[PDB]
Amino acid sequence: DSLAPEDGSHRPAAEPTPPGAQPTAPGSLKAPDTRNEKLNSLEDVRKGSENYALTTNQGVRIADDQNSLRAGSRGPTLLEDFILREKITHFDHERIPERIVHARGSAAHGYFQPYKSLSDITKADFLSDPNKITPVFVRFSTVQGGAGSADTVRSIRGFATKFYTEEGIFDLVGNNTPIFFIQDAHKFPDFVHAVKPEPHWAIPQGQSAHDTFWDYVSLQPETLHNVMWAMSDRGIPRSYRTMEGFGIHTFRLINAEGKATFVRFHWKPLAGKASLVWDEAQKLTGRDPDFHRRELWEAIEAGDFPEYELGFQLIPEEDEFKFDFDLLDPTKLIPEELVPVQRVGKMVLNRNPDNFFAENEQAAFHPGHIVPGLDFTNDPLLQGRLFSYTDTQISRLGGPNFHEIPINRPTCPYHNFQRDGMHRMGIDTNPANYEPNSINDNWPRETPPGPKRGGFESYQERVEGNKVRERSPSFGEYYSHPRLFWLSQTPFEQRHIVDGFSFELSKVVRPYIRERVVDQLAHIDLTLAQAVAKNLGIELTDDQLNITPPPDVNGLKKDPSLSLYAIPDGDVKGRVVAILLNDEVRSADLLAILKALKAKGVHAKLLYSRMGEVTADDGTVLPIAATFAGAPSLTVDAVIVPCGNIADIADNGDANYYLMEAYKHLKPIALAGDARKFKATIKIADQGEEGIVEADSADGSFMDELLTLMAAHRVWSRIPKIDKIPA
Amino acid sequence: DSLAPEDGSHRPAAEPTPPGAQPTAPGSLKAPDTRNEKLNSLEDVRKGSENYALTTNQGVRIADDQNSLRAGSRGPTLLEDFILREKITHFDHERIPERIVHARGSAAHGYFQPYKSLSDITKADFLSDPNKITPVFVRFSTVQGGAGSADTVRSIRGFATKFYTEEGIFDLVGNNTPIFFIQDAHKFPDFVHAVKPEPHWAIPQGQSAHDTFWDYVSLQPETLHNVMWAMSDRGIPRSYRTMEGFGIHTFRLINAEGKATFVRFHWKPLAGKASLVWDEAQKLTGRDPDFHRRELWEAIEAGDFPEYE
Amino acid sequence: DSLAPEDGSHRPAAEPTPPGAQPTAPGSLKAPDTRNEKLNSLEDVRKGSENYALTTNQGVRIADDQNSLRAGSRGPTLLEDFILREKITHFDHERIPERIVHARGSAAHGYFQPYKSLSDITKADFLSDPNKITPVFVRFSTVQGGAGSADTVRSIRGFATKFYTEEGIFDLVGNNTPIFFIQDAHKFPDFVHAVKPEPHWAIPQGQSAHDTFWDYVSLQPETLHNVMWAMSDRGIPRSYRTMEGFGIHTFRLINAEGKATFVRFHWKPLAGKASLVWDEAQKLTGRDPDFHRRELWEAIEAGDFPEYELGFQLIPEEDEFKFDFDLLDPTKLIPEELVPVQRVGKMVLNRNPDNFFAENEQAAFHPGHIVPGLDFTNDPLLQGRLFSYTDTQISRLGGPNFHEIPINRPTCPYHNFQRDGMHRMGIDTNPANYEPNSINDNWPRETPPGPKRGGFESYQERVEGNKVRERSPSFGEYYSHPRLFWLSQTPFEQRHIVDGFSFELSKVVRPYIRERVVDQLAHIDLTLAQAVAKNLGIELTDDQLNITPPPDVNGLKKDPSLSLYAIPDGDVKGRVVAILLNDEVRSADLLAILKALKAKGVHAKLLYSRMGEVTADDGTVLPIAATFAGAPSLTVDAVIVPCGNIADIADNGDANYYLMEAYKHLKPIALAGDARKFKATIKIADQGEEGIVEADSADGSFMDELLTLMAAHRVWSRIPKIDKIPA
Amino acid sequence: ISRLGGPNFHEIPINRPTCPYHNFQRDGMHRMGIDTNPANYEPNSINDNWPRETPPGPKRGGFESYQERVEGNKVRERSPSFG
Ligand code: HEM
Numbered sequence A, C: 001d002s003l004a005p006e007d008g009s010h011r012p013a014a015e016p017t018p019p020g021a022q023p024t025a026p027g028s029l030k031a032p033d034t035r036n037e038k039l040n041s042l043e044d045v046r047k048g049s050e051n052y053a054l055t056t057n058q059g060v061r062i063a064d065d066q067n068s069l070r071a072g073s074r075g076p077t078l079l080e081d082f083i084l085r086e087k088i089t090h091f092d093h094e095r096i097p098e099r100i101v102h103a104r105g106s107a108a109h110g111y112f113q114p115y116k117s118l119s120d121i122t123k124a125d126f127l128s129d130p131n132k133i134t135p136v137f138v139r140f141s142t143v144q145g146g147a148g149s150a151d152t153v154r155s156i157r158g159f160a161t162k163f164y165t166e167e168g169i170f171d172l173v174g175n176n177t178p179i180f181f182i183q184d185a186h187k188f189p190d191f192v193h194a195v196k197p198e199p200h201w202a203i204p205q206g207q208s209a210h211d212t213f214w215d216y217v218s219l220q221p222e223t224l225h226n227v228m229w230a231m232s233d234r235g236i237p238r239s240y241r242t243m244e245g246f247g248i249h250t251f252r253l254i255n256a257e258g259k260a261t262f263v264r265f266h267w268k269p270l271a272g273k274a275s276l277v278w279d280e281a282q283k284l285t286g287r288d289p290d291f292h293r294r295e296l297w298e299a300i301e302a303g304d305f306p307e308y309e310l311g312f313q314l315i316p317e318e319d320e321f322k323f324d325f326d327l328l329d330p331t332k333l334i335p336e337e338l339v340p341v342q343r344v345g346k347m348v349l350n351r352n353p354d355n356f357f358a359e360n361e362q363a364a365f366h367p368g369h370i371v372p373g374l375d376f377t378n379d380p381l382l383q384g385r386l387f388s389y390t391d392t393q394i395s396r397l398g399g400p401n402f403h404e405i406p407i408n409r410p411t412c413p414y415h416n417f418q419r420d421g422m423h424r425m426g427i428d429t430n431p432a433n434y435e436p437n438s439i440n441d442n443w444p445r446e447t448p449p450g451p452k453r454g455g456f457e458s459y460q461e462r463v464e465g466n467k468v469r470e471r472s473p474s475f476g477e478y479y480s481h482p483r484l485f486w487l488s489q490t491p492f493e494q495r496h497i498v499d500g501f502s503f504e505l506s507k508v509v510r511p512y513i514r515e516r517v518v519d520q521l522a523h524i525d526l527t528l529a530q531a532v533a534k535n536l537g538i539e540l541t542d543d544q545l546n547i548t549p550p551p552d553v554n555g556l557k558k559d560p561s562l563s564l565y566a567i568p569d570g571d572v573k574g575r576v577v578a579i580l581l582n583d584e585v586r587s588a589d590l591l592a593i594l595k596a597l598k599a600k601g602v603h604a605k606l607l608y609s610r611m612g613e614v615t616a617d618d619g620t621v622l623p624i625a626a627t628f629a630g631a632p633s634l635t636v637d638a639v640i641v642p643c644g645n646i647a648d649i650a651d652n653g654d655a656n657y658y659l660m661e662a663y664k665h666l667k668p669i670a671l672a673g674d675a676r677k678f679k680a681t682i683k684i685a686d687q688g689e690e691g692i693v694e695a696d697s698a699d700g701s702f703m704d705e706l707l708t709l710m711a712a713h714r715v716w717s718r719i720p721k722i723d724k725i726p727a
Numbered sequence B: 001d002s003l004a005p006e007d008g009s010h011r012p013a014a015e016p017t018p019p020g021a022q023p024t025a026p027g028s029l030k031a032p033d034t035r036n037e038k039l040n041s042l043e044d045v046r047k048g049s050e051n052y053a054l055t056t057n058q059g060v061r062i063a064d065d066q067n068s069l070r071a072g073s074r075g076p077t078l079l080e081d082f083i084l085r086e087k088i089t090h091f092d093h094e095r096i097p098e099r100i101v102h103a104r105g106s107a108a109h110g111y112f113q114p115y116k117s118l119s120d121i122t123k124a125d126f127l128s129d130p131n132k133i134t135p136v137f138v139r140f141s142t143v144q145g146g147a148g149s150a151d152t153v154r155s156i157r158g159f160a161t162k163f164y165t166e167e168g169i170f171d172l173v174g175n176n177t178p179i180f181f182i183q184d185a186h187k188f189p190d191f192v193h194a195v196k197p198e199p200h201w202a203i204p205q206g207q208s209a210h211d212t213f214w215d216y217v218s219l220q221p222e223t224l225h226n227v228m229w230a231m232s233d234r235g236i237p238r239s240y241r242t243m244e245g246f247g248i249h250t251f252r253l254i255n256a257e258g259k260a261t262f263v264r265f266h267w268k269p270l271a272g273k274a275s276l277v278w279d280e281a282q283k284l285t286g287r288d289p290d291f292h293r294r295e296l297w298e299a300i301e302a303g304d305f306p307e308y309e
Numbered sequence D: 001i002s003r004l005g006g007p008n009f010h011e012i013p014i015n016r017p018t019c020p021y022h023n024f025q026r027d028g029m030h031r032m033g034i035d036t037n038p039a040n041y042e043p044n045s046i047n048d049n050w051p052r053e054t055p056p057g058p059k060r061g062g063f064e065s066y067q068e069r070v071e072g073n074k075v076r077e078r079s080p081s082f083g
């Protein structure tokens, strides 16, 4: 053979490259020198290919991999074809059950390091020294949809981190919003069945916009806080890099003296917080159902590593009852104004997996996987989680040895008396499989709890009460946090929330369900309630207009850390700009353009009405990455149109649509020279409009303007003007 | 309890209604008078719900389905809470492996009847008498995507029919195009791996528009015929009702005298043939990823029964 | 804790030691220096224990492995105890389905080496050079019984060898008899269901002595050949080391020139052929259900490595139709008098596993696993087998990745485009998962067939005929092979066969089934049929008495290779003798006895009426291995009673019974000095009798006489004398 | 769950209750029972919340655990009275 092109263009370069410059590849092939302890210990199961013969799984070389064995060349296939049968059998058994929830997700390897030793508050070894590096494997996800569902759905997002520490795996299994929808794990199946596809016909996929979700929510007001977050732009993240992460539950840090400190875990995006707008997210589910998964992969291949800061909200044991909400109540957030997040470390995601199925599909995270230094609390949602993840993994990964699947193995020692189980890899030589034993001198042996390298001992919390199936009365308050969240949003964030509720409830077929939801909103905030009501053609009653608003939270009437955008934190590095080409581009605009983007780490995609290449005024040959229809404005953060021969694209319906879409979706648009004729398509005044960069040519002032707009992410002052754009 | 609205607008009318008029429902509640032999024999396993107490799977009545058992109302959950563990355990084990191919599909019950006896060419009992009616169960599907992928992708479509005949189940497992991509079964795993999401990153979902697929096609010219079909509007049917169906392979019919006749199986849409245009199909994967499943369900609920010859 | 004895006696020495001398142990601790390529490649999954901390599977050290977490020391167990839950969860899921047939088996590691290149007849790499060593893993088994059934039942034995060749795994899956019960694989479920426990009550375990088996046999005369073998002493082998092994089916050897030669595979036991007698075997199923497993393991711990010679019956393509029987009929043997077994190589089993579950229980052998140089034939039983092993392994071993379980992995390279599946360990880096591809330059690639290291290509056998479900008329002959077998047996063997059928038919409750089997025996041989009928109180009719005997097989009226004992082949090394002590043994006798046994590699077990020690006449302290009742005569090959204070045990019922049982089961007995007072117990004349060694002391020829008797295995001449005797 | 292949082991004939069993558990490997309830969750309004919880009582009542008093710290400890 030799099917590869002689020029070597089938293989991507093993160096950082921008999105779309090269074919993506397995991490170890794309960045062979990006290493960490976990990645290196996976080297025993990694399998190459180049220069090897094709074989059965028993090692027998195959001569003809194109044909079954038959009696005559037009005869019947023969039972003795063991090569065909092994190949089809393995193929026939490829699939395993997807995750019950969070089936759709994207993962990467990276590392964690603390900013300082935290031994005063925890004896956790991975937190003990700023020079201790811990390998991580992180999986981001949606909740409801199948493994084949779309990424940019409206949804809570999962954010799970497996820390491979020297004293055990610690999995921090969180989401992108600080609370959950429900209080007690006993209701998880009910909730999840309500949000998932309805059982008669299994519709709708990956959406909460259906009758059973809003029915459950209308009947269970504890859900309203997380529903608020889901209806906000938090439920449609621009990227997994630009969203927050939260453990949700209050846990415990145990120091070496044995002091317990209540803690809530936080991941702060160093790229900043950024979300899509609903019409763009929903259209993206059809043009690129893999958008987030692709963006993650290509940000890492480009060297735009996703980086997050680990943060702790720390509350002393004596302050347990100092708030006006229960700290164990998972539908309640701890406002950063009351208890600040202490920046404790940084996590960097810097290498993709080699095989999606082996590493991401088979990875198993569990909140119950803790290490000495950490402990649980009585949070009734967390308590029930401790049982489920272990149970579900027995069938999802076929047995009790899922910790022997390479991605799941600890990198530290593990020795015990557990044996057998389906697909047992470990061959134990211990003469004993029980303890106490004398035949192996009682090894492996228990270890007393201690300051370092000690055995696990639970914090000795005092437990007093009767065995009861009862919700704590302290958990019975459902509207103050939703109200606090609502008042902390900017006006346009508020409007997005209203629009999220209105669009979802418009899809509820049974009108009484929408009315019961609006009634719940009336208990939160009347302006929110009226605005949703008005979109549903509902009139609030007399009684609903007089509902007394819930109390503030510990004196707070808002908290800007709950907004995505109130406090400017945007970052342009890794964002992408679409450049609309023409057949004779002013090459001086392109150079100014590309030089400037490249200095801010912003990528570009050269678009035209056909593939191939175009030639600039000076004769520069410009390669086209995609067409206008093929890489729609939904996929980029901004649109730039350089001068040249605009008449080539001024009547291109796709070109005009590109700008109208980008305009509708509040993205920065820049028009150089004769590209200013596109102003009429998006009806921009002669004097201009904030959000639209326009100049005689593409100099440095023009690129600074555009890049300033990109750092502000979207042009929120344009909201009022997009009503009147048919797009 | 008093949860359903007093006006009864929670329950859909048990009668044929047009799309959007009533909330959709399980078939035996939506159309209780529709029957066939297969639907009747499923009766011993159907489970109701109205007026029954809530219980564990062992039949123990539950008093509080809102809470876990704990030591104090703010205490730790107890291991003895067998009601919680049974409920969460069953939830934990709800999934099964999706199909290797054609994981995304929509199905419906129906019946088949031959126009006339075919005993001169086949001794198949289900084709032996115009009065003999055979219950069927049919599943329509895409090929590449997972169970959670979108319906109106560009794809070949499966059309599988299970015939519950009096001499055995006959499954007629076809597609909506008259040929397949490949010639020998030994290459199936090669072709399917090439069409499926590439192995390093698992992109793209439900689409053939990516390098490995065209790579495979370009090296295996036998695939061009079905590729042509897939690139045409045949790849984006308007509805499972407006697409043809084919068994593709030449099979044999065997009569009572032992005479063999080569046969190729066909399904003709009595609603006629119709497809979307690409832009509309791709945008609909975004706006309504369940559009064909929904359209099939609603046509049946409306009485626009999908019909095929 | 530090529970071992300070003397270090909890630990067996890492050196060859006789059976019973030390506690047995995992192979790699008992013989660390016994290595081979496969044994070395498993080192990546072997797990130690000593000096390691006890942990969870996630690597978290455990402090208290004696207690659950509860709310108070007498309170309820908490759901948050994740250590308890992982520990119980793994335990709860330890079991996997047992093999459908051959569930009971015992296995060991070893190696194979050919005597000379066989390149002229086969291009199989493991047979091409006498210096080429192939690691093997072998499992011996019963057929019907569960994994927990007894070793010494009457039954065919499995003898499966996994050859880890440089060109792939080759599994040689045979039995201990040269034919099988049935001709076509479609009846395997019927035959197996008939021999297995009857469905209503699941009785009887591990035995063919019941109605459904004999019902099936009486309606399917194709089974008689293998039923004869099973009813003979072949069905109750003394040890897996003293039985023959056969591939049964005719396969093909393909040389580099493309020439096909027909072959039947044989294994010759270098320890010789030896079986138990029925009463002893049956009693041994109760006293020690693990006798074969134990003997195999202790033989290897003592250095008595089981050794077998691989032999080939070779038949040219031109002689396919030259026999009276069809070569492709698995119910027919190839008489060694017609086609000699050509010695090919030697297999030595020299190391036990470390963990029975991991290596033995999960080992997957498959007769379809062949390598270039071998090929199948149309034998219809073989043809269906090729489908079954692959299939059954998907459920028994949890998925299509069972080749990744350590014991099953090829030691040679394996690369292909198969992906995923449950429990996937291999992380593929190939950009391509399909071929032909250009993106990896088509790797891994197909390899043409050739003399060495080429791809597999099936032999181009001509196929011709119609698609039919039809038994070949050449297979319709059922009685001449059974007759040949019968006539080749010694007279005491024939009697044992008659006793086997008689006993088994006596457990058949429906008398007509017994009558029908008798009618079938009457088509084989009249003497056999009459003797069995007499034992059942059945009279043959005049017609049955006139059935004409089936023809000879190609002129043969007998073939001594078919007998276990017609041709002496006794080997004493590794046998074991019971020494019945008294409380003042003449140490002079003991010294003579022990030295002589040791000189021949014959083991001894010192027995007494209690455990502890006894002191010889000269003050030698003698350690007792077991009591008379605890290590019964069933477990030794011979019995020696030295002089001393015989009055100590003269009236010991167990001591007397011990001799009665050993005498009844035809074992050599030696009585020294006053030990001759035991002659009355077994009714021995004053003058003596062949099979009883007696002298004034254990000097001179006393040990040589006893060892000559051991070399002939049992005292067949004593049969008539045991008839009576109440034991 | 592994011995009997999934969570629907209560549907294997010998294991089935002879009394009524109704709840909102669904799916799982080898699911026999075909549920017609429009709802697979509670509380629900679309099936008027059936099947419903039943208060504890003298006969045919819902299960309620005996309210035993629990007092102690979280410990992995054998009671001294067991020694
Ligand atoms: C604070 C509330 C919760 C959060 C933040 C959370 C988060 C997550 C995340 C991030 C995943 C995906 C992990 C991965 O990427 O593999 C997941 C999966 C899962 N969750 Fe939770 N979850 C919560 C509540 C619950 C509850 C209450 C239960 C059941 C009592 C539960 C049961 C599961 C199960 C069974 C899975 C699938 C695990 C697997 O198959 O490996 N979750 N959850």
Ligand code: HEM
Residues within 6 Å of the ligand: A088, A092, B098, B099, B100, B101, B102, B105, B139, B140, B141, B157, B158, B159, B160, B173, B174, B175, B180, B184, B185, B188, B247, B248, B249
């Ligand atoms: C003439 C070409 C083919 C046609 C028309 C076809 C059609 C189909 C259809 C319609 C389904 C979905 C059945 C359902 O709705 O559940 C299906 C599934 C499947 N196909 Fe085929 N297919 C073809 C070729 C193949 C080949 C060559 C193989 C393997 C050699 C194969 C293996 C499978 C498997 C394993 C499934 C999943 C079945 C299950 O999990 O129940 N298909 N195919």
Ligand code: HEM
Residues within 6 Å of the ligand: C098, C099, C100, C101, C102, C105, C139, C140, C141, C157, C158, C159, C160, C173, C174, C175, C179, C180, C184, C185, C188, C247, C248, C249, C330, C363, C364, C365, C381, C382, C384, C385, C388, C389, C392, C393, C396
């Ligand atoms: C010449 C006739 C046969 C011989 C010599 C033979 C020999 C054996 C042996 C020695 C084993 C046990 C392997 C081990 O130790 O793991 C075995 C297992 C087995 N046999 Fe065969 N057998 C024969 C006929 C058949 C037939 C006709 C079938 C079905 C078509 C069959 C199906 C099986 C299966 C399913 C297993 C269990 C394997 C596993 O779970 O890995 N055998 N046989």
